[PDB]
């Protein structure tokens, strides 16, 4: 005897919002903390004082 919410079907539309869809991206700690050395090949040799 009445029109329910289930009786209008998809004349009622569900909405979408991206306001909750975001995450801050966090970099490497060690790439920010220490010196970054540009390597041109697989291996580099570094001499150090030892005695």
């Amino acid at each position: 005897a009445d029109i329910s919410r289930a009786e209008v079907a998809t004349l009622i539309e569900e909405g979408y919002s991206h306001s909750l869809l975001a995450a801050a991206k966090q970099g490497s700690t060690v790439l920010s903390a220490f010196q970054n050395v540009n390597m041109g090949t697989k291996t580099t040799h570094l001499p150090v004082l030892a005695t």
Binding site: Q26, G27, S28, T29, V30, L31, S32, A33, F34, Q35, N36, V37, N38, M39, G40, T41, K42, T44, L46
Partner: protein, 52 residues
């Protein structure tokens, strides 16, 4: 604020192992990170991933 004189860095990417350490104190002149290739991206569309 107690940690004066240090440069402080906080891990925010979930890499920290709290069962292993509270902090590292270092001479930063003595640690190097070699960067041979930065993060590079390839788009794959024909490839096979895995076996069996």
């Amino acid at each position: 604020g107690s940690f004066l004189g240090f440069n402080t860095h906080f891990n925010r990417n979930g890499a920290w192992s709290p069962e292993s350490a509270v902090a590292f104190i270092a001479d930063s002149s003595r640690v190097k990170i070699g960067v041979r290739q930065d993060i590079t991206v390839k788009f794959l569309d024909q490839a096979t991933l895995g076996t069996g």
